[PDB]
Write a protein that binds this ligand. Structure first.
Ligand code: WMG
Ligand code: WMD
Length: 460
């Protein structure tokens, strides 16, 4: 039975509004309703992995697991296995997989982050799950961010706290946050970003939604505008939105948006908004294709509609050679030429690099770079031809060209990372000098760039 080179992943996010679900929720898992929907011809084809994020979830873990498993069983006639379940307050993540993936899934981690302080600590935050699927690392984050149209900067801060403090994936990747630890990272939830238009325009917005004319609404979506201004979710992707706003509905119908200020809302307006979102970040040149992104029309117990997204994702096999794992493959090497880091820092410490990759036995520390003053004020750290030669555990090009090198640039004085990035080994040529580039981030914000050339030698 061959190992797969692709899997499909279902991502669901649903703010349940503290109400039990209706008896039938299959439309969610089938990607049916509004937006980019799944073809009917696929209905009986199970996804490989289902990741369900809820917010304001009133059910016990046992109650929700039984509903989810019975739902998937009805759709597919497959009894899915529970990979992980983790709950913080009323924010929950469930990961289910085809039982045929029992010996492909390992290194399962869960964690949560509570956002806010004092007044604002006690119901918002995030849960997450990671695991390995054969040679591929997968991370999943369900976050419930701060509510309210005038709190976009709070949401952005909640995002930064979650990606700093959520402890998933390989702890040996010590300089790296969750935005670098996974081949594929999916981040979803009630992100709570709103359509920033004046309150007086509520009925105009409703009209536009009835016409399915979303362009003038999406141009004011706070998540899209904050992303475009690099304030949040830097280097994440989102499919185009082609479904109506998923909040705030009168319960038991989808015919009415309930937007007016009420004592129950803290006298706040809830203009129709795309609160409920799925974004992703995959390592460079790894296959990932969104195959659905939409909302259900027939699940009406909450003031939010469920959101679905599905993906094709590239995966690699757990490679064994005659040599690695447990030795090097002399026949392989990774060389770096004309390399320099450009950093936004005002500091003047010496810097060194660390190279981390599951194609290395352990991470590799470089010598210190040579600091120069860049012409527009920046710091340029030159490595030139000084970087170590990396010795992969396996030299087979079918393995090595699928790998990635994580890079951290660290202060010699504090051993703190000033920037993290990722280089793909999926090169156009081997034994050939080729340009490489990554942006560098720290705490998920841009701090610089790393560029140079690479020379990859495989067994072929
Ligand atoms: C242009 C930018 C963007 C697109 C639509 C909305 C917000 C944005 F920031 N992309 C972000 C993801 N990667 C490629 C570039
Ligand atoms: C429970 C879990 C599992 C079973 C089926 C499908 C996926 C999955 F992660 N185990 C992983 C490690 N090996 C034993 C099984």
């Amino acid at each position: 039975q061959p190992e797969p080179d692709m899997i499909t992943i279902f991502i669901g996010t649903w703010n349940m509004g503290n109400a039990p679900p209706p008896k039938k929720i299959t439309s969610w898992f089938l990607s049916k309703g509004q937006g980019k929907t799944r073809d009917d011809s696929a209905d009986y084809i199970p996804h490989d992995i289902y990741v369900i994020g809820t917010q304001e979830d009133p059910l016990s873990e046992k109650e929700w697991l039984e509903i989810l498993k019975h739902s998937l069983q009805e759709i597919t006639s497959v009894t899915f296995k529970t990979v992980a379940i983790h709950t913080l307050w009323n924010i929950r993540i469930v990961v289910l997989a085809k039982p045929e993936h029992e010996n492909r899934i390992s290194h399962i981690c869960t964690d949560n982050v509570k956002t806010g302080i004092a007044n604002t600590l006690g119901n918002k935050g995030a849960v997450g799950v990671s695991f390995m699927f054969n040679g591929t690392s997968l991370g999943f984050v369900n976050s419930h961010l701060t509510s309210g149209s005038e709190k976009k900067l709070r949401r952005n801060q909640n995002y930064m706290n979650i990606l700093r403090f959520l402890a998933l994936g390989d702890k040996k990747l010590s300089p790296f946050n969750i935005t670098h630890r996974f081949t594929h990272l999916f981040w979803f939830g009630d992100l709570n970003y709103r359509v920033d238009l004046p309150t007086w325009e509520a009925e105009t917005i409703i009209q536009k939604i009835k016409q399915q004319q979303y362009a003038d609404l999406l141009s004011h979506d706070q998540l899209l505008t904050e992303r475009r201004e690099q304030k949040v979710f830097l280097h994440f992707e989102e499919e185009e939105i082609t479904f109506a706003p998923t909040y705030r509905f009168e319960r038991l119908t989808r015919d009415k948006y309930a937007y007016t200020k009420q004592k129950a809302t803290g006298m706040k307006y809830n203009l129709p908004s795309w609160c409920d979102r799925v974004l992703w970040k995959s390592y460079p040149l790894v296959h990932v294709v969104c195959q659905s992104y939409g909302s259900t029309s027939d699940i009406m117990t909450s003031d939010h509609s469920p959101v679905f997204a599905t993906f094709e994702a590239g995966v690699t096999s757990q490679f064994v050679s005659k040599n690695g794992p447990g030795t090097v493959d002399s026949q392989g090497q990774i060389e770096f030429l004309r390399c320099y880091a450009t950093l936004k820092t005002k500091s003047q410490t010496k810097f060194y690099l660390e190279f981390h990759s599951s194609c290395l036995e352990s991470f590799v520390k470089s010598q210190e770079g040579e600091n120069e003053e860049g012409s527009e004020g920046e710091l340029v750290v030159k490595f030139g031809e000084t970087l170590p030669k990396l010795k992969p555990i396996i030299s087979d090009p079918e393995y090595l060209l699928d790998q990635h090198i994580l890079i951290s640039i660290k202060s010699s004085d504090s051993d703190e990372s000033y920037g993290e990035g990722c280089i793909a080994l999926r090169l156009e040529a081997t034994e050939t000098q080729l340009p490489i580039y990554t942006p560098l981030t720290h705490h998920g914000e841009l701090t610089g760039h790393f560029q140079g050339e690479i020379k990859l030698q495989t067994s072929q």
